[PDB]
Amino acid sequence: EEGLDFPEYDGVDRVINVNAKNYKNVFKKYEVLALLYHEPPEDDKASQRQFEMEELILELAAQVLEDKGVGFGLVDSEKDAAVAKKLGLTEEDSIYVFKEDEVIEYDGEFSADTLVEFLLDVLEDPVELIEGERELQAFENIEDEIKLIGYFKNKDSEHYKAFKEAAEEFHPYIPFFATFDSKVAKKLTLKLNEIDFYEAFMEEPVTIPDKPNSEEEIVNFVEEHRRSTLRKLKPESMYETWEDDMDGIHIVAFAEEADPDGYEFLEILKSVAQDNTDNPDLSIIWIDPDDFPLLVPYWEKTFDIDLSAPQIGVVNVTDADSVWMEMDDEEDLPSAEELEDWLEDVLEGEINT
Numbered sequence: 001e002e003g004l005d006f007p008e009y010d011g012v013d014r015v016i017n018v019n020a021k022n023y024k025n026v027f028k029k030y031e032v033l034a035l036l037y038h039e040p041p042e043d044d045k046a047s048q049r050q051f052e053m054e055e056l057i058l059e060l061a062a063q064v065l066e067d068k069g070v071g072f073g074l075v076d077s078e079k080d081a082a083v084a085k086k087l088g089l090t091e092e093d094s095i096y097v098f099k100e101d102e103v104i105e106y107d108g109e110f111s112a113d114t115l116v117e118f119l120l121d122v123l124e125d126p127v128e129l130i131e132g133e134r135e136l137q138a139f140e141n142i143e144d145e146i147k148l149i150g151y152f153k154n155k156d157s158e159h160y161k162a163f164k165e166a167a168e169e170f171h172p173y174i175p176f177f178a179t180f181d182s183k184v185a186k187k188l189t190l191k192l193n194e195i196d197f198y199e200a201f202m203e204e205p206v207t208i209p210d211k212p213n214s215e216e217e218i219v220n221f222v223e224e225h226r227r228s229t230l231r232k233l234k235p236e237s238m239y240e241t242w243e244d245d246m247d248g249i250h251i252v253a254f255a256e257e258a259d260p261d262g263y264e265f266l267e268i269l270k271s272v273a274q275d276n277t278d279n280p281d282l283s284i285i286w287i288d289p290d291d292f293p294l295l296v297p298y299w300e301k302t303f304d305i306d307l308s309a310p311q312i313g314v315v316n317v318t319d320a321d322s323v324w325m326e327m328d329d330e331e332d333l334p335s336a337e338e339l340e341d342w343l344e345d346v347l348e349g350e351i352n353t
């Protein structure tokens with residue numbers, strides 16, 4: 001016999017050199033197009049190696065997604081300046097994703113797995129319809145991201161169309177769900193044309209006021225409620241989340257969800273978030289170390305902590321200086337009240353913002 005190999009990177013180049021002469025053709029060919037806006041080659045070996053790596057990561061993603069009609073291209077900030085201008089490419093060494101009439105400024109991990117998962121998400125339709133019990137339960141079980149759900153008469157409702165337009169503005173980062181089924185709406189407690197917004201990790205939704213809602217009303221509401229009290233650092237959005245600091249610091253909690261102590265600590269964090277949900281000055285970033293294996297050594301060294309145990313601290317975004325709460329693993333984890341008390345102590349006397 002033979003034994004067929006697992007798929008492997010084949011070393012065939014698929015990433016397109018996008019330029020003035022071909023960019024129109026390239027957009028016609030692909031339903032989803034990912035473009036890396038990058039700088040011309042520097043004379044130093046290090047920067048050249050960095051670009052070499054990035055381009056190869058794109059090549060791998062390009063091979064994986066070839067059959068699904070996702071295209072990958074490079075736009076040189078000098079050689080292709082006019083193209084960049086026309087497409088709105090501004091952020092140096094950054095990935096932009098195009099689908100129909102939407103442009104996405106990718107602000108996530110530059111890795112093949114993360115990029116492929118993201119682009120697969122981009123390919124999906126912007127609104128998820130709930131009809132069956134399995135789908136409803138799936139909706140209800142989402143906690144680690146903001147989600148919206150609306151009840152409409154049918155797909156031809158002017159108000160469903162507005163909801164879908166809003167959904168496209170945030171696709172694929174914020175899931176929008178709809179139902180046309182009165183029995184599903186009843187379980188969700190939605191009146192016709194009502195839209196419920198669920199903050200991450202919050203049990204109770206907030207209804208968008210003044211229904212029926214225009215596209216703008218929905219987009220306005222989502223933008224105002226973009227930052228959850230507790231938010232998870234996710235590969236797909238990590239840079240956006242981190243760059244959104246609270247007056248120069250982040251409260252950061254490490255917890256491994258799959259670990260007994262990590263799970264318990266997460267439940268405590270959720271309680272803290274719930275009890276402070278209307279405090280616009282509070283945002284905690286939850287990082288599950290299991291999601292970022294390549295950063296664990298760095299974090300353990302930089303923060304001087306053991307990531308096999310739950311941690312909570314405050315980090316200065318300018319220099320990564322930090323302070324972490326002492327917890328004895330021979331004792332029970334701190335209560336939500338204890339955590340809040342500690343945060344108050346640290347943020348009151350050690351913050352001159």
Ligand SMILES: *[C@@H]1O[C@H](CO)[C@@H](O[C@@H]2O[C@H](CO)[C@@H](O[C@@H]3O[C@H](CO)[C@@H](O)[C@H](O[C@H]4O[C@H](CO)[C@@H](O)[C@H](O)[C@@H]4O)[C@@H]3O)[C@H](O)[C@H]2NC(C)=O)[C@H](O)[C@H]1NC(C)=O
Binds near residue numbers: 248249319321
């Ligand atoms: C997060 O971390 C950053 C550190 O990377 C930190 O910013 C630093 O803050 C210090 C505070 O001491 C800045 O230094 C002072 O800034 C004041 C501004 O008013 C100056 O007057 C000071 O100069 C005086 O002090 C100097 C000695 O440090 C003297 O040489 C000078 O003549 C005056 O006496 C001094 O510059 C420091 O420069 C910044 N560095 C930055 C911003 O990069 C920030 O405080 C931390 N943020 C939080 C929220 O904790």
Ligand SMILES: [Ca+2]
Binds near residue numbers: 016017018019074080
């Ligand atoms: Ca190019």
Ligand SMILES: [Ca+2]
Binds near residue numbers: 117118119236
């Ligand atoms: Ca994704």
Ligand SMILES: [Ca+2]
Binds near residue numbers: 188189190191
């Ligand atoms: Ca209701």
Ligand SMILES: [Ca+2]
Binds near residue numbers: 209210211212217
């Ligand atoms: Ca309205």
Ligand SMILES: [Ca+2]
Binds near residue numbers: 199228229277278279
């Ligand atoms: Ca909140």
Ligand SMILES: [Ca+2]
Binds near residue numbers: 291293
């Ligand atoms: Ca990762």
Ligand code: NA
Binds near residue numbers: 121172173174
């Ligand atoms: Na998503």
Ligand code: NA
Binds near residue numbers: 317
């Ligand atoms: Na700062």
Ligand code: NA
Binds near residue numbers: 288290
């Ligand atoms: Na985990």
